Amino acid sequence: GPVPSRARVYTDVNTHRPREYWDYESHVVEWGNQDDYQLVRKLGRGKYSEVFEAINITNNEKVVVKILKPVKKKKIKREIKILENLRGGPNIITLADIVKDPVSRTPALVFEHVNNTDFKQLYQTLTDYDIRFYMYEILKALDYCHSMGIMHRDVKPHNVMIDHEHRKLRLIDWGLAEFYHPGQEYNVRVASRYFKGPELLVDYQMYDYSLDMWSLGCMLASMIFRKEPFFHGHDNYDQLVRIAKVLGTEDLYDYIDKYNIELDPRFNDILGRHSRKRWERFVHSENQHLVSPEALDFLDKLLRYDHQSRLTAREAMEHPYFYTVVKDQA
Numbered sequence: 001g002p003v004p005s006r007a008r009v010y011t012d013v014n015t016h017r018p019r020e021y022w023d024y025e026s027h028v029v030e031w032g033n034q035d036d037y038q039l040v041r042k043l044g045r046g047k048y049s050e051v052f053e054a055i056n057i058t059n060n061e062k063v064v065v066k067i068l069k070p071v072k073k074k075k076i077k078r079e080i081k082i083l084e085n086l087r088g089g090p091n092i093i094t095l096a097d098i099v100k101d102p103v104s105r106t107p108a109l110v111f112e113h114v115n116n117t118d119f120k121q122l123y124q125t126l127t128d129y130d131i132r133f134y135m136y137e138i139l140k141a142l143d144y145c146h147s148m149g150i151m152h153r154d155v156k157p158h159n160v161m162i163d164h165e166h167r168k169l170r171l172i173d174w175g176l177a178e179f180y181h182p183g184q185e186y187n188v189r190v191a192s193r194y195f196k197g198p199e200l201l202v203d204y205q206m207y208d209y210s211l212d213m214w215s216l217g218c219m220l221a222s223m224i225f226r227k228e229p230f231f232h233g234h235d236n237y238d239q240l241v242r243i244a245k246v247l248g249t250e251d252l253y254d255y256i257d258k259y260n261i262e263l264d265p266r267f268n269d270i271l272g273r274h275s276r277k278r279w280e281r282f283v284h285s286e287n288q289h290l291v292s293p294e295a296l297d298f299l300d301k302l303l304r305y306d307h308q309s310r311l312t313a314r315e316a317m318e319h320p321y322f323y324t325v326v327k328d329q330a
């Protein structure tokens with residue numbers, strides 16, 4: 001059976017709390033009236049939701065209503081709990097209200113509005129300093145919620161709302177976030193395919209905060225190489241191959257051994273033998289202004305199979321990649 005694993009930071013944060021902090025299934029939710037908000041326009045469809053710009057009648061402030069698509073009621077309580085738990089954390093989205101349409105009686109979350117620029121036009125225009133700044137701001141959100149016993153489990157560009165005029169950022173969609181408890185085996189069918197850590201692709205269920213750190217590497221590599229996405233796999237099985245073609249197969253296989261992981265028989269063929277590439281293969285004419293010996297070193301220290309050797313959010317923020325943004329924040 002698979003060797004166990006314990007997160008190497010914030011391992012026991014949750015054990016040390018009142019039970020009601022993390023025992024969300026008993027959380028008693030007070031549902032408001034959704035007529036307090038009039039929907040203006042659809043901002044986007046989701047897999048588990050539909051999101052609308054809306055107006056708060058009382059004050060006239062722009063708001064966002066995320067009507068939740070029908071899932072196990074405790075998953076809603078999980079998301080609500082995690083949001084009331086993180087309220088006011090650096091760069092976390094703010095849950096303004098919880099309501100239910102009086103006619104449909106179908107639950108919805110009301111969040112603060114963010115004048116966001118979507119990454120489809122944004123990531124194509126950021127200077128090297130901008131990539132350092134916003135990445136640092138993501139790390140603020142990740143280290144906070146990790147320190148608070150929560151993994152986000154779905155870090156990807158659509159979930160990072162960026163406001164470029166006021167240089168603000170907020171990390172959103174907490175509907176897949178879980179509380180971390182040492183020894184818990186988690187579901188591996190979480191996150192989006194391009195940002196799935198190798199632990200999810202091989203079905204290693206005792207994962208932790210560090211999964212969020214692989215997703216951040218995928219983003220970092222996607223931005224500094226102007227490749228969206230960086231690991232462009234055809235499914236979950238081929239996704240591991242796209243990773244392996246870059247990180248090498250020796251290493252992956254020691255990772256399988258180090259945890260006595262049972263590989264699917266499917267993987268036993270399509271993976272092959274592959275060397276570990278030097279990141280220089282990916283830098284070309286039109287993306288070298290964004291690459292530096294620093295970014296490469298930071299990036300190398302996120303993309304590791306072994307979830308235990310990834311940087312922590314806290315370690316990431318002390319990387320020299322961020323020395324200037326740390327300075328200009330003084």
Ligand SMILES: CNc1nc2cc(C(=O)O)ccc2c2cnccc12
Pocket residue numbers: 043044051064066093111112113114115116161172173174175
């Ligand atoms: C696709 N557009 C938006 N989706 C959101 C999703 C969540 C959530 O699921 O947590 C929270 C907030 C927003 C949001 C906020 N302001 C402007 C736009 C959006």
